[PDB]
Amino acid sequence: MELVRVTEAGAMAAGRWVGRGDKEGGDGAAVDAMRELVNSVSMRGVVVIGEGEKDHAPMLYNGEEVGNGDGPECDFAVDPIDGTTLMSKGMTNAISVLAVADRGTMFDPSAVFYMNKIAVGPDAAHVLDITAPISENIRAVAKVKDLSVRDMTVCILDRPRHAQLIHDVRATGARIRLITDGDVAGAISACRPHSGTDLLAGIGGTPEGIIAAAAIRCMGGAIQAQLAPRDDAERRKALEAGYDLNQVLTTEDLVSGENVFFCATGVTDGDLLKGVRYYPGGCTTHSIVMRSKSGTVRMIEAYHRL
Ligand SMILES: O=P(O)(O)OC[C@H]1O[C@](O)(COP(=O)(O)O)[C@@H](O)[C@@H]1O
Ligand SMILES: [Mg+2]
C-alpha cells in the first residue's frame, strides 16, 4: 500500500518547477516520478482516467497497466498537477492527486466532454438536484445547514462560461469564492466542515470531477454531475450518437467501488495542503490520505533525506 508516496513523489519533482514559468516541465517531472514509483507497488491497475490517449500524450494514458503486476485489479485515476498554471506562476493551491477504486467502478472514459458539477458536504447531501436552478440548491442547502442565504459561500471557477452562474448566485445574496484553477481541492473544501466553502458549482473537467467524487465518497458528502460539451458542434455530435446529456451522475455513479482510496500531496501552498519545502538535507511534503472502508482521513507531513 505504498500509494501515498506516489503523489508525494509527484509533488517533489513538480515542486522543482514552481515559479519557473514552464508548465510542461512540471507536468513531465511529476508524471515521470509518479509512473516510476507506481510501477513498483504490488498492484495491478488500469488507468481509467489520466493524462490522455496513446498519441500525443505519451505517459500516463488511459488503459495503461500500471504497477509491478501483483495485487488485485483496480481502476486508477491521477491528476499529476491540479492547477499546473498555479505551479508555473508560483501561486498557491496546487496539488498532485490520486484515486484508486475497484476494477470497473470508476466512471466511463467514453468520449471527451467537460462536466458540469455541483457538490456539498454530508450536511445537505440528499437535497442536491443539479437540474434545479442554483437558487433552489442554495436555498435548500442553506436551510439544511441552518444558515442564512446571505452567509452561503459558493465556490465557482472564475471563467467566462460561468458568468451567468455567478450572477445567479449573487442574486440570492450568497458569497462566491472565485477560484482560478483546481476544482478537486475546491470540492473537497466544500465537503470539508468549517472550511468556509459550503457548496461547489460549475462546469469543470471530468477527470477532476471523478477524482473529487472519489474523495467525496471517502470523506462523506455528495457530488452530482452532468456531462457537457464545449461547443454546439459537440452538442450536435452527442445528438447523432445518442448521449443523454440530461443524465445526472451521482457520487456513486462516478466511483462505485467498496474500498476507495484518495490521496493528494501539496505542490504549492494550498488551502488544504502545504507545498513542498526544500532544505539541503531533503524536503518536507504534506499530504492527505482518505480511505472509504474506515473513513479515517489522515494528514501526513513527511520528512525526507537522501
Ligand atoms: O482551465 P479550464 O480549461 O477552463 O477548466 C478548468 C479545469 O482545469 C483545472 O484547473 C486543471 O488544472 P490545469 O488545467 O492547470 O492542469 C481543473 O481543476 C478544472 O476543472
Ligand atoms: Mg492537470
* Closest among 185, 191, 216 to 86, alpha carbons compared: 185
The minimum-distance atom of ligand 1 relative to the CA of 186 is 18
Residue 227 phi, psi (nearest 5) = -65, 155
- Report whether 229 belongs to an annotated binding site: no
160 CA distance to ligand 1 middle (Å)? 13
Residues 206 and 247: beta-carbon distance below 8 Å: no
135 CA distance to ligand 2 middle (Å)? 30
Q: Determination method here?
A: X-ray
Distance, CA of 240 to CA of 246 (rounded, Å): 15
Instruction: Scan for cell 505551479, then name that residue.
Output: 87
Burial of 295 (0-12, 13-18, 19+ CB in 10 A): exposed
How would you classify residue 83: left for phi > 0, otherwise alpha for psi between -120 and 50, otherwise beta?
Answer: left
Q: How many CB atoms lie within 10 A of CB 21?
A: 11
Amino acid letter, 291: R
Residue nearest to atom 6 of ligand 1 (CA): 204
Residues 121 and 221: beta-carbon distance below 8 Å: yes
Distance, CA of 106 to CA of 74 (rounded, Å): 9
Nearest 5 degrees, angle CA 297-CA 50-CA 111? 120
Amino acid letter, 244: D
Which ligand minimizes its atom distance to the CA of 86?
A: 1
Nearest 5 degrees, angle CA 266-CA 269-CA 274? 55
The minimum-distance atom of ligand 1 relative to the CA of 204 is 20
Nearest 5 degrees, angle CA 296-CA 182-CA 79? 70
Task: Using DSSP bridges, classify how beta strands 222-228 and 74-82 pair: parallel, antiparallel or unpaired.
Answer: unpaired
Ligand 1: list residues with CB < 6 Å.
82-85, 157, 159, 181-183, 204-205, 208
The minimum-distance atom of ligand 1 relative to the CA of 205 is 20
Task: Using DSSP bridges, classify how beta strands 114-120 and 222-228 pair: parallel, antiparallel or unpaired.
Answer: antiparallel
Task: Using DSSP bridges, classify how beta strands 74-82 and 282-291 pair: parallel, antiparallel or unpaired.
Answer: unpaired
Residues 125 and 145: beta-carbon distance below 8 Å: no
Distance, CA of 34 to CA of 51 (rounded, Å): 12
**What resolution in angstroms, rounded to 1 decimal?**
3.7
Residue 51 phi, psi (nearest 5) = -65, -50
Helix or strand (DSSP H, E) at 282 = strand 282-291
> Domain extents for the chain?
1-103+259-306, 104-258
Amino acid letter, 205: G
Distance, CA of 10 to CA of 263 (rounded, Å): 12
Instruction: Scan for cell 457530488, then name that residue.
Output: 223
Residue nearest to atom 13 of ligand 1 (CA): 83
Helix 23-38 with 3-15: angle, nearest 10 deg: 150
